[PDB]
Amino acid sequence: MATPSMLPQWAYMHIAGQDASEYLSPGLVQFARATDTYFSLGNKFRNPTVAPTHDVTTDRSQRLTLRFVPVDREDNTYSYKVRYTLAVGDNRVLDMASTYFDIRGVLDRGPSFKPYSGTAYNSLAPKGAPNSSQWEQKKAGNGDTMETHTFGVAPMGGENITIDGLQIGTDATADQDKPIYADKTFQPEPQVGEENWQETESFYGGRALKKDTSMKPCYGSYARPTNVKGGQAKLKVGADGVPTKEFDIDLAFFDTPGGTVNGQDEYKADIVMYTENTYLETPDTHVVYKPGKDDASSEINLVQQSMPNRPNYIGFRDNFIGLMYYNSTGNMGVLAGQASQLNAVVDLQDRNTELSYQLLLDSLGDRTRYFSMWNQAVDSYDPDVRIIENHGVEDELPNYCFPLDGSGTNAAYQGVKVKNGNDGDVESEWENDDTVAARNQLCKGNIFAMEINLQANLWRSFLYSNVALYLPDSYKYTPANITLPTNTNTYDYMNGRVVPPSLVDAYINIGARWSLDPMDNVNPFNHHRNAGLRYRSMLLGNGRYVPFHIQVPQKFFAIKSLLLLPGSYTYEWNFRKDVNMILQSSLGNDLRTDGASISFTSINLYATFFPMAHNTASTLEAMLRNDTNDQSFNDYLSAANMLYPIPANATNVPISIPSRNWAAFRGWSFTRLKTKETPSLGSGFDPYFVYSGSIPYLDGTFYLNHTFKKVSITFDSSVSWPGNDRLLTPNEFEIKRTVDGEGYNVAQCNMTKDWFLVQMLAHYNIGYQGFYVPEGYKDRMYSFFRNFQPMSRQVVDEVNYKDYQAVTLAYQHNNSGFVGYLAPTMRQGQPYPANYPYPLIGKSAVTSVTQKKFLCDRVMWRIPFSSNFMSMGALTDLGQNMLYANSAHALDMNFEVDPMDESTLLYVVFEVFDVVRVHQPHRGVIEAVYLRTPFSAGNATT
């Protein structure tokens, strides 16, 4: 039924009663507990659960969403300043978690943009195919008479060729059947040909391009339609300019040579072509070879090669990094009272809010779940890019192509039958059949075919495009037919440079897992297989011109999770209109030069209020106006953040810190950046920032942690801190030991046992009781364990191999006759033995050396400031020996780094407490005190 109703019958059915274990007999309650692990009774009894009916929601008209329009705004030349009055009514409590900007505008991306890696026009074409195009030349011509030579194909049959060109249609009876001639505009379509592999013979017609159109290979060729019937002809230039009703289309007729051939006095057509001038273009390809020096129409401009342009993905950064000024001078935010007017935000230059917020959401959810609201999508690489695992290709079956008829080459055969047998292949006596046709098409032997190792060329192609193109430009050369921009940060320069495919081929480091040596210093978040970047790019669209609407959160730690009480408040924030700073690229080309532009129209502030009951909201208002109920937060990366140069090709960084208190000091962290990839914060515009790839500094996507070989700590100028005899190298840390003869290396790479211990105590917090894989929540995206990748390979021993000849790239050959000569161009050469990689396996293996290294990407090295190198409390044990044995001491740190051929920075993080603490003592009043301990501001001025 359903007849029972109201409260007594809602406690009878346990919709709104007491829980089971209050209504059950108390013998069954203890029986259930007794039997629980092998015969549960928990699912047999319904537990009520009632919402609170009063003092949790208001019945008054109150919005749950409010949109604050700007009260003042001014656009600068590269900044946008937007002020609001953020008001919180009486009995409304606001959380600053739920506030976010709405930014709308127009985004332009340069012509560098190309969110794909193929070509969109043709693409099944050979890259040598040239279209159907005629040219003029003197091949025996003289004067103003030029021979006109046409190369082409005429694909569709006809019935006759006359003065009206192809005749293919026919009219029905109305005064005989009239011919219908193909329209000039579009009728001999290039997509229509024969539908059979049996010839349609007769006459043929086709299309062609003028010699007024310049040749470009068929592969990425495009000409816009000029008719709604998909004609491509341009209008004739008349009296009234290019607008006319005429189209530039002519007819050129051809017949097979010879006087005997066709008429004796006639030379009737066999082929006709609708020549036309078009708006030919290559919107996404570039000519990678030509013999010529001028692009025109010529017999030698039939031969041209084409390659698609480099994929370049453009779109807003990971969490809208760099789209607001944080940690800046003269671009500081504001949150203040409306009457008080005193700012309650202080932003320091030794804070890194943007980096800090990456590390927060490491730890507070997964970063492999994309969110399109706040634009979350973490930069990444595929680990079959960065570390090349190679195993050859399974290709143990030949694969073939076959002709369409599949019977190879056929020849004429007449029938025969014996007149009466007698045995013999001519002596049984054979004679012609008249009931079996002459001219049968039979193929003796096996059908025609051409072998292709598909598997081989499927991994040849992939390996080239994800690795070779992203090699440094010290392995590239400019083609001998084109000129490139002087600027090396232009897209045009980058896709114009050509890399030999022999540098990285599927025939080197084979059977090894090993990142290439020139690919250890290339940022691996600047490639088209970065799937965080791809996501962000395609969440805007596929064209240059993108009107956008994005929602961008607050990130500054003081007011990120603040609960702002009743009162009226001035909120103001500044937004960067610098294209480099706000758009990531997959090549990292300078977008200012390229032509990207951005502008904002309409920035608003959202807020979301819990609709609390007025009674309950004013009880909580009163309680949080107390001076013992002050709201306190800290920066997640609570630290002093400092940069120090490393000169080019320099091996050490001398770092010295003045005498400083170290009370409540935590560890250090460090990572190496590049100067050009790091922008200068504390400036409204940095005009020398010409990068726009993944910024490691702010995105937390480091990749040069593996160039460190030592660090050393000294306090007082006389005491080594790792010098209480706690390490095998007893006065410094060594990160890499290259040349090991005490067996200090561990984990099958060049990394010391000492440092491996340290970086498993700083994270996992265990290493004194054996090493184990850390739990799933003890390791995260930026944790040490996940990004530690030992690797090794053998190479020829160049001193103890007695047939070692050093052959250069030029004099290496392998796939001779089946691949181009140091270029992605067509095949060249002869089948011949290879001579490139030296055998390392099987019989006739060469003597070899062992090379070992690791990569750590997305990890900062960290050394805790704890006697045992694991922290069992945020305020370290040596932070609390600086309340009794401190008076200020100097800290000098020495570092040894690998040489780099470009300027680099060292990023040393000194881990502190960043206390952001805030109190409201009255309505519309807000106060704060900001304090830090071992490094702090206001420690030598008021």
């Binding site: 829980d19 009632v50 730890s363 997640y636």
Partner: peptide, 26 residues
């Protein structure tokens, strides 16, 4: 760790009959 002890009052949930209700400041 990197800094995260920025956590709640270390209360427990309030006692009830029928799994849930609200008591406020009581």
């Amino acid at each position: 760790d990197i800094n995260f002890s920025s956590l709640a009052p270390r209360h427990g949930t309030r006692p009830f009959m029928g799994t849930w209700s609200d008591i406020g400041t009581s």
